[PDB]
Amino acid sequence: AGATLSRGPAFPGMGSEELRLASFYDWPLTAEVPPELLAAAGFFHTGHQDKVRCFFCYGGLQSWKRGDDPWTEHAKWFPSCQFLLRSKGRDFVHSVQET
Ligand SMILES: [Zn+2]
């Protein structure tokens, strides 16, 4: 019983936080979340608005707002992301899912 989550990042090149940070060179003025937090949480910027995708699970998120925690949003929407899980642990993700 049970298929396994594949281990390959959706976008291995964006596996680097530094490179993910570069993607936010045009992260909008009206956008309310710091790129550093987004890049740290595995997200890189796509498009020209405020859309991001996780380099690993490819979870796509937009409509970012003051206070929005990237790591939390990550756990909220993409709880099985192996990047999120290695970085924040099983406890953290469960803690976000159970609320
Ligand atoms: Zn992810």
Side-chain angles (χ1 to χ4, degrees), residues 18-94:
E18 177 94 343
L19 301 184
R20 284 199 302 278
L21 241 210
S23 65
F24 291 98
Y25 86 106
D26 64 340
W27 185 247
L29 302 107
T30 58
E32 305 144 66
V33 176
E36 305 93 296
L37 285 180
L38 289 153
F43 296 113
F44 66 94
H45 180 216
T46 62
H48 290 284
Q49 289 131 72
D50 79 321
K51 310 191 169 138
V52 295
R53 316 226 45 151
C54 170
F55 86 91
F56 195 94
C57 70
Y58 215 60
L61 291 168
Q62 65 196 87
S63 321
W64 291 91
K65 271 164 242 151
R66 249 175 160 230
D68 279 351
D69 185 56
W71 270 135
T72 299
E73 296 290 22
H74 214 153
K76 165 177 194 177
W77 295 104
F78 318 115
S80 70
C81 176
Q82 286 149 98
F83 176 69
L84 165 67
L85 277 158
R86 259 117 205 263
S87 300
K88 296 302 275 168
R90 219 84 180 77
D91 293 348
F92 173 80
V93 180
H94 193 264

